[PDB]
Paper text:
The CDF transporter MamM is a highly conserved protein within magnetotactic bacteria (MTB). MTB are an extraordinary group of prokaryotes that utilize CDF proteins for iron transport and biomineralization of magnetic iron nanoparticles within intracellular membrane-enclosed organelles called magnetosomes. MamM was recently proposed to function as a magnetosome-directed iron transporter required for iron biomineralization, since its deletion abolished magnetite biomineralization. As a case study, we introduced ZnT-8 Type-II diabetes-associated mutations into the magnetosomal CDF protein MamM.
The X-ray determined structure of MamM-CTD V260R contained two tightly packed monomers in the asymmetric unit. Overlapping the monomers of wild-type MamM-CTD and the V260R mutant demonstrated that both share a similar fold, with a Cα-RMSD of 0.43 Å. While the wild-type MamM-CTD structure contains a disordered C-terminal tail (residues 293-318), a rigid conformation was adopted by residues 294-302 in a single V260R monomer comprising the dimer. This rigid C-terminal extension gave rise to the formation of a fourth β-sheet aligned in parallel to the three existing β-sheets located in the inner metal-binding interface of the dimer. The V260R dimer presented a tighter and twisted conformation in reference to wild-type MamM-CTD dimeric structure. As such, the V260R dimer structure presents a dramatic increase in the dimerization interface surface (377 Å2), in reference to the dimerization interface surface of the wild-type (193 Å2). According to the V260R determined structure, the altered dimerization interface is stabilized asymmetrically by several salt bridges, polar and hydrophobic interactions located at the top and bottom of the dimer. The twisted dimeric fold of V260R allows the formation of the central putative binding site but prevents the formation of the wild-type His264-Glu289 double peripheral binding sites. However, by examining the V260R dimer, we could predict two alternative peripheral symmetrical binding sites between Glu268-His264, each from a different monomer. Although the V260R mutant dimer was able to bind the same number of zinc cations as the wild-type dimer in vitro, it was not functional in vivo.
Author numbering:
A (entry chain B): 211 to 302
B (entry chain A): 211 to 291
Write the structure that this text describes.
């Protein structure tokens, strides 16, 4: 595809469909054999309270883990973006 | 004992000292290249709101990450118990 890339993009689209998500900021995905362990940073509206931001992260974790075959583990955290800015997901 | 056994005890000791934590229910840690990735479940008092339970989880993450350099990613969730 490359393959990790096709899977990275599927993780991103699954997250980006969760209500409250304003973009995937960063995805780090590591291949343990066939399995994937991931750590994702999502953007959320700066209007959100901390409580609200936490629930968006929990919903992303459930949604991505439910949809993406061989996600062994996923951690999601949140950053308050934007007033505008701006950016396409990055990957490592 | 082994490196991973020693790492798992430090994680559990670090977590159990965070205010709000009522025991470590479950811990999985694994090596991935040069790094350690882990996932953990803490016990929290049932009286805690969900908001409160999330803030305990975050505090564990910061504490354990701060104390154990080689951990690249740690996920913490909570069960009321």
């Amino acid at each position: 595809g490359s393959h990790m890339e096709a899977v990275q993009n599927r993780i991103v689209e699954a997250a980006e469909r969760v209500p409250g998500v304003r973009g995937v900021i960063h995805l780090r995905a590591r291949y343990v054999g066939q399995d994937i362990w991931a750590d994702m940073i999502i953007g959320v509206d700066p209007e959100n309270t901390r409580e609200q931001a936490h629930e968006i992260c929990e919903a992303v974790q459930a949604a991505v883990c439910g949809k993406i075959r061989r996600i062994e583990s996923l951690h999601v955290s949140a950053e308050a973006r934007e007033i505008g800015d701006t950016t396409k997901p990055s990957f490592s």
